[PDB]
């Protein structure tokens, strides 16, 4: 059962696995039908775009801080800054997210600029609008017309300025301060109460 110099394997096939085998023979068929559904959805509402305008948000965690991606909807504050009510915004191709907020100014400003760019290209028809004007428009792809763009990494030339303390020493001191903050604060509190209680 165990023989030779081989890696030890974990092949989880001790249940009735063959009753739950999903083979994707329909990958191409689903691709084609998905494309047809997409054409039907587009042709139903043309020239109104099929995609709602989405915000741009930083990805969470220390691993994806650097990246920025499309969010779910614009915050109520962001829509407030451009003078659009969320109920109204949902009817002109703008997505709303009541859950997200803006702790910082950078994402808020990016999304306000994005909303103002979309708002400048918007043309809202009405009863007085005739089919000649409506036919003068093409159904654009909002996901491509207002793409999510990564901020460029800093590159190019800058003056070299060397601090006296090295970066490695700074990191070590930060680690040490964090590691001993609690015990140092407890020690200082005890010292202060001792030398200001008996010094009463």
């Amino acid at each position: 059962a165990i023989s030779k110099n081989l890696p030890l394997l974990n092949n989880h096939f001790r249940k009735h696995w063959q009753e739950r085998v999903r083979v994707h023979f329909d990958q191409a068929g689903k691709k084609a039908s998905r494309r047809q559904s997409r054409l039907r959805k587009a042709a139903k509402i043309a020239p109104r775009p099929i995609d709602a305008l989405r915000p741009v948000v930083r990805a969470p965690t220390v691993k994806y801080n650097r990246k920025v991606r499309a969010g779910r909807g614009f915050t109520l504050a962001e829509l407030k800054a451009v003078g659009i009510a969320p109920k109204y915004a949902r009817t002109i191709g703008i997505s709303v997210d009541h859950r997200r907020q803006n702790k910082s100014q950078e994402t808020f400003d990016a999304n306000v600029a994005r909303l103002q760019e979309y708002k400048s290209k918007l043309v809202i028809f009405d009863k007085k609008t005739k089919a000649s004007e409506v036919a003068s428009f093409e159904q654009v792809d909002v996901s491509a017309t207002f793409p999510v763009e990564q901020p460029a990494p800093e590159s190019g030339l800058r003056a070299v300025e060397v601090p006296e303390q090295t970066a490695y020493r700074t990191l070590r001191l930060a680690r040490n301060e964090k590691k001993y903050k609690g015990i140092r604060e407890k020690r200082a509190k005890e010292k202060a109460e001792a030398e200001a209680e008996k010094a009463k």
């Binding site: 910082s104 990191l171 930060a174 301060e177």
Partner: protein
């Protein structure tokens, strides 16, 4: 700004320009209102005290703060809730001394 600007230590992280956030109304959930304060005071008059709450009051009157807390934790379940219940039963006693 608000973060240290470096990846280690106390208050680590990237500095950003802070923007003041309008508080959500859902965060007001624990707040009390005039309506609920009023209704709860009358219901206390109509309903009265529970059997374990009368037992708690006797222990507090007999100077058993340590005894009352052990009972209140045994009844309510957690130490945090027992502390609030004993404080509430002392205020009931404090309102019966006039």
């Amino acid at each position: 700004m608000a973060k240290s600007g470096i990846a280690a230590g106390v208050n680590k992280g990237r500095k950003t320009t802070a923007k003041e956030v309008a508080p959500k109304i859902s965060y007001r959930k624990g707040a009390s209102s005039q309506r609920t304060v009023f209704v709860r005071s009358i219901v206390k008059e109509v309903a009265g005290l529970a059997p374990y709450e009368r037992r708690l009051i006797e222990l507090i009157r007999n100077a058993g703060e340590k005894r009352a807390k052990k009972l209140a934790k045994k009844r309510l379940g957690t130490h945090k809730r027992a502390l609030r219940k004993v404080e509430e039963m002392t205020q009931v006693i404090a309102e019966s001394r006039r």
